[PDB]
Write a protein that binds this ligand. Structure first.
Ligand SMILES: Nc1ncnc2c1ncn2[C@@H]1O[C@H](COP(=O)(O)OP(=O)(O)O)[C@@H](O)[C@H]1O
Ligand SMILES: [Mg+2]
Lengths: 208, 31
């Protein structure tokens, strides 16, 4: 079946049909400061919750290429949502990716960890790639995307990836596309690339 | 620090082709 992970925002969850889906890659596009990283942190916490609370009783994997992953931001999100932050941190597997070859390497290892965590009390249900953004370079990215698609499908996990935009967006094939932008008074606006959600970034992470 | 078995790693390589080792990942708490 297809599982869903709450984003912490009622408005955002409705635009997505209930939250980010498993066995699929969800792509977020936006300019700097649009909230892509904050949403990736929120999800890394939301996935850990029972399905009644909008999670999947799972764990999250976080591949960071922007050096923007913050364990203390995770603590704030967990503490504010009433969760044990030491436990929330234990359930997030984090790797910093220095180059494209390294990212690809980490994907093989992340896959190995998913295999092992299968059928346990807390399997890895989410994979975050922040951020996704020569003849070979284009080819490598395509290969990376194919691997991600195979992971989402074979391990029933939700794949969340971020793209930095410098309007006419070139999205990757077979993904769910969401476009984030800054609205009025700290509010953020979400809209599907293929009607609109409004949300905030708060001490609880993402919320209405 | 997080560990992974050589067997799961072997299974992973086979999957993308078309006891413990280094995983490259750690918990957000530093383990
Ligand atoms: N602890 C926090 N509480 C509320 N808002 C925050 C917090 N930390 C960062 N933000 C805000 O979240 C917004 C989104 O940042 P970020 O997710 O890094 O965007 P992007 O990844 O799209 O560049 C920023 O405007 C930032 O000021
Ligand atoms: Mg960012």
């Amino acid at each position: 079946t297809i599982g869903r992970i709450s984003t912490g925002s009622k408005s955002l969850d409705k635009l997505l049909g209930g939250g980010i889906e498993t066995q699929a890659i969800t792509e977020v596009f936006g300019e700097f400061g649009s909230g892509k990283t904050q949403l990736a942190h929120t999800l890394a916490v939301m996935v850990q919750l029972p399905p009644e609370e909008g999670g999947l009783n799972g764990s999250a994997m976080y591949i960071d290429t922007e050096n923007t992953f913050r364990p203390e931001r995770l603590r704030e999100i967990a503490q504010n949502r009433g969760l044990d932050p030491d436990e929330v941190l234990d359930n997030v597997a984090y790797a910093r990716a220095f180059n494209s070859n390294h990212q690809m390497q980490l994907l093989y290892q992340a896959s190995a960890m998913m295999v092992e965590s299968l059928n346990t009390d807390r399997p890895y249900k989410l994979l975050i790639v922040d951020s996704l953004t020569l003849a070979e370079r284009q080819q490598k990215l395509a290969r990376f995307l194919r691997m991600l698609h195979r992971l989402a499908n074979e391990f029933d996990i939700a794949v969340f990836v971020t793209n930095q935009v410098q309007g006419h967006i070139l999205a990757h094939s077979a993904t769910l596309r969401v476009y984030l932008r800054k609205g009025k008074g700290g509010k953020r606006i979400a809209r599907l690339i293929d009607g609109e959600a409004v949300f905030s970034i708060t001490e609880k992470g993402i919320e209405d | 620090k997080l560990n992974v078995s050589t067997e799961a790693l072997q299974k992973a390589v086979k999957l993308f082709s078309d006891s413990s080792a280094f995983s490259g990942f750690s918990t957000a708490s530093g383990k």
